Amino acid sequence: EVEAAISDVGGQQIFSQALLNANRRGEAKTALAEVQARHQELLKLEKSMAELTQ
C-alpha cells in the first residue's frame, strides 16, 4: 500500500550579499582629486620660498 514521498518544509538557509554607498563614487572625492591642483600650489610655495632662501 503506502510509504514515504516528499517531506520537510521548516528548514532553509540563505547567504547575503551587499552593495555600497553611491556618493563613494570614484576614489577621487575630497582630498583625492583636489591633490592635483593642491600640488601646483605647493610647488608654488616651494618656488616662492626658493626665491626667499636665495
Binding site: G10, G11, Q12, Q13
Partner: protein, 505 residues
Amino acid sequence: FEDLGVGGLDKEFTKIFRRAFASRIFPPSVIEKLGISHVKGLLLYGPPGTGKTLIARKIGTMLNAKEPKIVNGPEILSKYVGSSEENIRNLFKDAEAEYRAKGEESSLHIIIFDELDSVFKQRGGVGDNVVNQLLAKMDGVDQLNNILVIGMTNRKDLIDSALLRPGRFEVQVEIHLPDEKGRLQIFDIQTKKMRENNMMSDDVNLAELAALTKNFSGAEIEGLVKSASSFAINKTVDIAKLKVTREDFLNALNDVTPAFGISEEDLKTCVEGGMMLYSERVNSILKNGARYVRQVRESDKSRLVSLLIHGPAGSGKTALAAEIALKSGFPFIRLISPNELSGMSESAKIAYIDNTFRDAYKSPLNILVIDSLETLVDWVPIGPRFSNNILQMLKVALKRKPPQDRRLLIMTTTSAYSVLQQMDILSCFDNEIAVPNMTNLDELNNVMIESNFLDDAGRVKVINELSRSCPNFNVGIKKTLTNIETARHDEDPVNELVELMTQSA
C-alpha cells in the same frame, strides 16, 4: 454584566469575574498584603460562531487595558528555520519593556490567540520547537505579572498536557448554544438602533420570533435582522414612515438556513417521486416509525436507539427513512450518503464522518440517517475487498451514548443482510423493519391508477393478460415505475409494458 452587549451568558460572567478580576480590582495595598499573584491565562472553548471573539474583546475594555493584539493560529508558521517561532517571541516585547521601566504600576496588556490547537499538539519537526518556545516564556525565570493571554478553541482534548497546569492556563470555560432566553435577549440587544430611533412597527412581537427560531447560533440573528431591514427598505423604493413590519421578518426567517438545523432540501430531493400507498404495508411501516420516534422523545434512560431497515434491492428503502424523518419535527437533521463522499481521500472520509458525528452531541434533540453501508465500506465480492478502517469507525460510533442529557436517533439502511452477518456486525442494532417487494396484481392496479397510466380499457386488458400469463408476479417498485413511464412515452401498451414486465420478473 448585561448592561454590555452580550445576552444569555450569565453564569460564565459570574465565574470569570470571581476567578479572574477579584484580584485586580482592590487597591494594591490590600492584595499585596495578601501576597497572591495574578492569573495569567484563560481558555474558553466552544463551537464556532457563538460570540467568543466578542466576549474576549469586551473584557479588555472593562479593565481599561491597552488595545488588544491579535493573531490567528496557522499564520504563525513560516517556512524558514526558527522564524515560525520568532513571531511567537515578538509578541511579549512591549510588555517586558513597560514592566522593566515602570514596574508594578504598568497598565495591563492583552493578547489573543485564535485556533490554538492548530499548532500546539501534544509533544513527544517544527511543532516541538513551537510548543517549547511558548512554554519557556509563558512562565520563565524572570517574573512578568502585568499580562493576560486568552485562548479560543473547539477541541480541548488535543492541547498538550503542560499548558493546562496551574500557572499557565488556569481557567477553563465552556460556551454552549443560546437557550430560548438567550435568543430573546439577543433580539433585545440587537434591535436597539431600530427601537429608540423609531423605525420598527408596534405589531412585531420578538418573543414569538425567538420562540420560532431554535438552534440559531447567535451570530446569524444579526444576519436575519439586517436582511429584514434591507428587505423593507428595498421594498419601499417614499419617506413617510420607514417601518419594518413582521412580513420582512417572516421572509428573512424563511430564507435563512441555520448551520445546526434541518437540512430539508436533500430530504425533499430524496422523496422526489411521491408517496402513494399502493398496499397495506406502507401504513404499518409508517406507524412503526412514529412509535419509535415517540419512544425516543418521551423516555429518560433510553437516550439512544439504533434502528435498521432492510430489504431486497430496489424495494424503495431509503424513501421510507426520509419520510419518517420529515414527519417528526426535530430540530437537527442531517444525511450522510455516498454522494457527498465521492472523490475524497480515505483520511478525508474518516474525518468527515467523525466530524458529522461529533456535531450532533451538542444539540438537545437529533436524528441522523445513513444511506447505504456496503457502498461506504467499499465492498466488492471477488476476493473480497473492503476498507477495514471505515468499518471500525462506524462500529465504534454506533455504541457511543451522548455525553450528556442530549438525545439521538440513528437510522440506517442496507440491502445485503447476509454479508452483515458474515461480517459479525449485526449486534449493533436493536430493531429491524423489513421491506419486501410486490407480489400481487391488485397492487399493480393501485399503482397504475395512481400514476394514471392509461384509460380503463388498457388497464383492464393488461391486468387480465398478466393474470393469465404471469402467475407468480414478483418485482420491486423501481422497475414498475420506470417501466410504466417507458410504456407511456412509447407506443402500444401491450407491445412493451406486458412484455417488459414479464421479462423483468
